[PDB]
């Protein structure tokens, strides 16, 4: 029964929500470390015709 089992089974959504939030926060921290994107001597590359960044 909806709106009844939710009051008892709503705790099961906490961990997956934490997981997706952690993935979002990992991307959050990743976005701040692009000072050398497409600048290392090993992977100096010319951009593709429809490409703006090598990795996101």
């Amino acid at each position: 029964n909806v709106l009844q089992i939710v009051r008892d089974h709503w705790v099961h959504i906490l961990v997956p929500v934490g997981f997706v939030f952690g993935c979002y926060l990992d991307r959050r921290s990743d976005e701040k470390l692009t000072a050398f994107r497409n600048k290392s001597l090993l992977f100096k590359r010319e951009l593709r015709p429809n490409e703006e960044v090598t990795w996101k």
Partner: protein, 459 residues
Amino acid sequence: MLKIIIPTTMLLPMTWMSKHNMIWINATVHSLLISLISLSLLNQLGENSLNFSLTFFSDSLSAPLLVLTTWLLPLMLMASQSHLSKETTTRKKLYITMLILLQLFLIMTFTATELILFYILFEATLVPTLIIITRWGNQTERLNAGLYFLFYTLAGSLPLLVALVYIQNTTGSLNFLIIHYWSHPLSNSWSNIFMWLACIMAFMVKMPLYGLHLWLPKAHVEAPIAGSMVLAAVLLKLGGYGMMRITTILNPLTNYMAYPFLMLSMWGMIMTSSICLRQTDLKSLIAYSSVSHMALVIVAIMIQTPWSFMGATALMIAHGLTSSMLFCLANTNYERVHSRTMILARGLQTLLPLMATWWLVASLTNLALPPSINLIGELFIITASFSWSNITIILMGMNMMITALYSLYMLITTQRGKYTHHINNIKPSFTRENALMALHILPLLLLTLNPKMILGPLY
């Protein structure tokens, strides 16, 4: 890395908000899911490391330890669910909270890109373990054990902190990457000798070293089943991880300073293996076996060769799993018998055959039977020590002989012979205990198929 930390933090709200009769199910399910998530860290590179951010990074030495730490929590919950049956909901939730906090601290400790953060989490892991030992313990000596398990650790760890900050004043950075890339040789000086000692003894006390192993039998005996599991499986490996991380700056002074600890470990392995032979307690015998294995790991780390490090990593993983299984089996016997003495209950193979099979497999994997990863680590360390010096083989072989002797002694005393007549409360083993044994043993025999997953960064 937050994809693992955040679910572990959300495990707390879930437990507290959980129904009064649904805490164990939710905790076990979500802990297993978090272990599945953490399984992704095994995909390492032959290059430097998995640098997620400025605060956390992963490595093929940290990855197996993290996987084992995430895997241990469901087993700990399954083991603890039995003896906490007559316990109030608030205090059961507090127990689960302590377990979750310990897992979170260990997970953050094993990444620890900076050494001061590593020290902070490495000493933060102390509080939940002390609370678990001194609160949910049976005997009156638990308090004493807790005191020991505390002060020994601090007696080694307080100087380390000083050394750590001193290094940051000289080097300018305690980040592991900068420390590795900018490492400089240590001049053979008294000041450098004392800095070496301050950096080393903090991790040597927790392995533990043979001289400083007194706290371990007390802490393991008086702690509950979950406390014994977490102490034997993961908490002992913190010293080895710290030593492997910190020995980079200690060269070349390590060559001269390794001699006392090498001698102490090489003789204390024999001493503890012989002590195991004359023991009237199962938990104490398992604790002394753990001491012997960690002494071998200390020898491996001090030898400081690639094969040494590979064998050390494999041995830590294998020993953690094996000791957790042995403690679980001993606790299953104790819950029926309530005496914790080897000679009291005998001939249990007649009454509990499947549990006897579990006992046999645990004893065999503790005996370092090939091609188990226990044997892989032991053989790698033995070969590295033989390359270090050809005379170590005598002590190593003696240790193997005594190890086999006491393992089969433990098996035969409790499983073989005639049953005790006056004991009649030996009920058939439950599905929970058998599932616990299977979940402990299957990963070992699966990891022996892919050894490179647990051989560390020097593979």
